Ligand binder design. Structure first.
Ligand code: BCL
Ligand code: BCL
Ligand code: BCL
Ligand code: BCL
Ligand code: BCL
Ligand code: BCL
Ligand code: BCL
Ligand code: BCL
Ligand code: BCL
Ligand SMILES: CC(C)=CCC/C(C)=C/CC/C(C)=C/CC/C(C)=C/C=C/C=C(\C)CC/C=C(\C)CC/C=C(\C)CCC=C(C)C
Lengths: 43, 57, 43, 57, 43, 57, 43, 57, 43, 57, 43, 57, 43, 57, 57, 43
């Protein structure tokens, strides 16, 4: 009887994929920031 | 208690459609991509050197 | 019982078409970037 | 387990309507295309050399 | 049982009209573009 | 298997209402047309030579 | 069992009124254009 | 098959409400008219010779 | 079984009020256009 | 067949709520009025002679 | 069986409160307008 | 027929929630108030004399 | 059978809290206006 | 008849969720906060002195 | 009465999905992230120095 | 029979996490403001 309607297993499985995808997005964003600083430094 | 297994991508990428119904969201997805193309074109078109409008009156 | 309501077969087969179309869109975009660099190089 | 077959386009293009209900999304599609036209016109119109407004008072 | 609720016949019939309409729209846009190139060439 | 017949337009144009519920989309349609007319007016009016605002002061 | 829920007769009557109204709107738009061309010619 | 009769307007204009539910669309209609008036005011007001803001400090 | 759900009497009654209100709105708009032309003529 | 009587306003103005559910539309109404007020302020405030922002340097 | 689902008494009471609030909003707006004309006359 | 009684405000102000469901509209109310604050800040901040951005290179 | 579906008790409780919150927001806004007039007087 | 008691905040703040369903409004709340941060960034970023973009070609 | 225990983050982060249906909000989440990236690009791209569009004449 | 549909326990638990996350967001924002004042003071 969760608010979203998801079971515990569904919420955990979705969160596991979401975290994995978020981590890759963050790593790529950090690499992009490093590359853009190399190309045109800021601050 | 439950401890979910580490997903393997892109092998498990099809599970997204188990979460997001394409019937509701495929058109929103396409429209967002279109918006992105429109904004990108806006910013590149605004540069006169990167648009084909070359006629001079 | 899936959150979206889709069956495993429906999800797989929507994904197969989505990947196919995404790949063609990406190849076309890469061709477009190559052509626009030829027309007016950037960086 | 289940392995979907590789789709053949454009022969399987009609299957999109099995996912996307035209009754819900056909007007949003047309409006999106209209918005694209309006944005393209706005960028091309804005070039004085590419609009028909030629009257000089 | 389809996601959209349409039968196969409805989807096919809709697609046939959509294709016909898109094709005329594309032909008209191509005519508009040659026409605008004649009036004011670009590139 | 099913092979849809080639539609004849404008004879079959009324079939669009069999797909698109007018009770739900007629007003959006008309609002879209109005938006287009506002946008067109906005690009033409912005040209001082094509608006009636002629008071000099 | 139409997608929109309309019967054939409803779709046909609505189309007939829509076409009539569209035609008046189009005539009026054409008038308005001719008229703005007289007031301030374009092209 | 079915051939609809030619509508007579404005005698048949009340039929619009049989298609368009006023409970749903009357307020959107009013808001759209309001948006038009606001856009029209924006274009006319923007012209200094057609707004009442005449104070000079 | 109308598309909107309204009966004929409802649609006619609503249209009657709509028309009356629209007429007053238009008369007021015509007044305002006359006053604004007197204050600042256009064309 | 049915011939609606001519409505008398403002005596029958209350009938609008029979058509428009206030539970759904009262807040949208207030928001629209606020949006008007904001737009009007934006056009008047833009005039430096009609805003209180008078601090020098 | 009203379109909005309201009863007659509900609509009347809501309209009575809406009129009262609208009148006070009106009176405050007229007071703001005079007041802004005292501060910075327009026209 | 039915004659509604003249409401006493602010004593009857709580009746607004009998018409407007807070579960649906409280959040959009707060978002509206936030939009107003953003718009006011935009107009005041735009004036350089009324924002804290005082650093100069 | 209220329009929103709230009982009288619910509407009154919510209003009590809304008023309390609104009052604090107003006192905070008045303090902020006093502080900004001190920092940068207007009018 | 009913006379609600004076609420005590922040002790009764949790009661907001009894009015506002977090499943519906949590994400809109988060988006609104994000919109605010984007607007604030927009006004501060616009000032070059509070801008990290320091490269000059 | 009931006194909730202090949550432990990020161990309890998965509980967000018990509140927020990802079927409904995952795509709005991703669109919001896309909007942010677009806004950030718009502010950084607008600076010629941080712009890859280097073609001149 | 709450307006939202949440039970007291659900509302309390959600509020506790909401508070905790809000508090961390606030501490991070205060740190951000301190760092930005160090980098470029305002007022
Ligand atoms: C996001 C939601 C779902 C999911 C749903 C989908 C769907 C649906 C699809 C994919 C697709 C893909 N998925 Mg998946 N995906 C998920 C999570 C993941 C994860 C992960 C660990 O989180 C991984 C590794 C992947 C992996 C992948 C890739 C194999 C593939 C996309 C390739 C691509 O676009 O490359 C990126 C390539 C580019 C961005 C190029 C852009 C072009 C260049 C940059 C233009 C610039 C040119 C200019 C000269 C550059 C300047 C030079 C300097 C570099 C600046 N997915 C989650 C579970 N995924 C697709 C697939 O299989 O496709 C066949 C697909 O359709
Ligand atoms: C996208 C969602 C659905 C789907 C639904 C539909 C629907 C619905 C339709 C199609 C249509 C088509 N689909 Mg399909 N389709 C999908 C996936 C695919 C895939 C794939 C492998 O993924 C393929 C190959 C296709 C293929 C096709 C084409 C046969 C056709 C569109 C022609 C077209 O517009 O060309 C592109 C043509 C152009 C871009 C014209 C360009 C005009 C020029 C560029 C204007 C500028 C001129 C200027 C001078 C140029 C400057 C010079 C330089 C070049 C810059 N589809 C998925 C499954 N598809 C349509 C169709 O069948 O029509 C008959 C149609 O109605
Ligand atoms: C800006 C530089 C040029 C110019 C160059 C071009 C070019 C190049 C093109 C246009 C196109 C269009 N131009 Mg332009 N155009 C200019 C100035 C104008 C002005 C103006 C104020 O001066 C206006 C009002 C227009 C108006 C328009 C539209 C008629 C059309 C885009 C439609 C659309 O939105 O499709 C998108 C919206 C939709 C698809 C939604 C549905 C609309 C309807 C229902 C589509 C019906 C399709 C169906 C098959 C029609 C059948 C009936 C036909 C009679 C056969 N142009 C100047 C002079 N214009 C395009 C065009 O002709 O496309 C065909 C196009 O490619
Ligand atoms: C649109 C959806 C429905 C429908 C629903 C409604 C509803 C609902 C209403 C109407 C109304 C009307 N309907 Mg009907 N109606 C439809 C289709 C039609 C058709 C048709 C053949 O398609 C016709 C002939 C009509 C006919 C009419 C009119 C009798 C009337 C509107 C008069 C009006 O505003 O004039 C237009 C007059 C103007 C635009 C004035 C312009 C103001 C001037 C121009 C300001 C500028 C001043 C400045 C000096 C000008 C510059 C000088 C130069 C000229 C430039 N309807 C369809 C079926 N209709 C209304 C009615 O009956 O009212 C009593 C009404 O409330
Ligand atoms: C619209 C939808 C519904 C309806 C629902 C409602 C509701 C709900 C309400 C009303 C209200 C009113 N209704 Mg009713 N009403 C309808 C249709 C009508 C019709 C009609 C024949 O169509 C009529 C005659 C009326 C009549 C009226 C009025 C008695 C009243 C609004 C007074 C007002 O605001 O004046 C307009 C006065 C102004 C706009 C003042 C303007 C401020 C000035 C101009 C500021 C500028 C200052 C500056 C110096 C000016 C420059 C000087 C020069 C002049 C330029 N209604 C339909 C049926 N009606 C309200 C009411 O009863 O209130 C007690 C109310 O709450
Ligand atoms: C721009 C030129 C002038 C100026 C001239 C005017 C004029 C002239 C007017 C205003 C009006 C207002 N202006 Mg201004 N004002 C200026 C500068 C400002 C600045 C600023 C940053 O400096 C601000 C924040 C404001 C703010 C305001 C609002 C208080 C008000 C518009 C209310 C509204 O949105 O109604 C629309 C929104 C709604 C209806 C939504 C509901 C909001 C609440 C619920 C309304 C309650 C109604 C009910 C009767 C209240 C009863 C309780 C009362 C205590 C009695 N002004 C400068 C100095 N301003 C208007 C006004 O006072 O209206 C009354 C007005 O007519
Ligand atoms: C609107 C929808 C509902 C309703 C729902 C609510 C709700 C919900 C609430 C109220 C609240 C209030 N209601 Mg009620 N209310 C309604 C209709 C009414 C009516 C009426 C006859 O129509 C009345 C008299 C009232 C009365 C009131 C007030 C007692 C109170 C708001 C005070 C306030 O904010 O003042 C306005 C005061 C200001 C705007 C101060 C502005 C500060 C200054 C102007 C900032 C600028 C500074 C700068 C120096 C100024 C420049 C100097 C010059 C002046 C230019 N309501 C209808 C029925 N009402 C609230 C309440 O009870 O709070 C305890 C509340 O939470
Ligand atoms: C609003 C809807 C609900 C409700 C739901 C919630 C929820 C949900 C939460 C709270 C939270 C809080 N609630 Mg509660 N709350 C309500 C109504 C109330 C009322 C009341 C009487 O109305 C009160 C007193 C409170 C009290 C509180 C606080 C204890 C707390 C927020 C602290 C905070 O952010 O401070 C504000 C502090 C700041 C804004 C700091 C700003 C930093 C500075 C200003 C940045 C600028 C720097 C620069 C140098 C400044 C320039 C210098 C000069 C000053 C210009 N709530 C109603 C009932 N409340 C939160 C909580 O408990 O957190 C633990 C929380 O998560
Ligand atoms: C918010 C709603 C939910 C929730 C749902 C989720 C979900 C869903 C996810 C997380 C994720 C995370 N959660 Mg949780 N989470 C919540 C509340 C919390 C709380 C808390 C006490 O409130 C905590 C401590 C955490 C903790 C965490 C982290 C372990 C993790 C995110 C890491 C991260 O992004 O770092 C932030 C890192 C950055 C912002 C880097 C930004 C890039 C840099 C700054 C680029 C600039 C470069 C330039 C040179 C900088 C200039 C130099 C100067 C510094 C200016 N969550 C609540 C309960 N949480 C994610 C996760 O587990 O991932 C594995 C994830 O997917
Ligand atoms: C420079 C520039 C930007 C120019 C733009 C040019 C353009 C595009 C202009 C567009 C012009 C148009 C295109 C305007 C549209 C105007 C319009 C179209 C107005 C409509 C007004 C309608 C009304 C004011 C009517 C309200 C009627 C009501 C409220 C009826 C309420 C009914 C009841 C109460 C009945 C109760 C019934 C029961 C059964 C109980």
């Amino acid at each position: 009887n969760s608010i979203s309607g998801l079971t515990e297993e569904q919420a955990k499985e979705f969160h596991e994929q979401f975290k994995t995808t978020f981590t890759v997005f963050m790593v790529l964003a950090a690499a992009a920031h490093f590359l853009v600083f190399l190309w045109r430094p800021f601050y | 208690e439950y401890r979910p297994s580490k997903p393997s991508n892109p092998r498990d990428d099809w599970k997204l459609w188990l979460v997001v119904n394409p019937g509701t969201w495929l058109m929103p997805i396409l429209m967002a991509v279109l918006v992105v193309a429109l904004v990108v074109h806006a910013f590149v078109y605004s540069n006169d050197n990167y648009n084909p409008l070359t006629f001079d009156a």
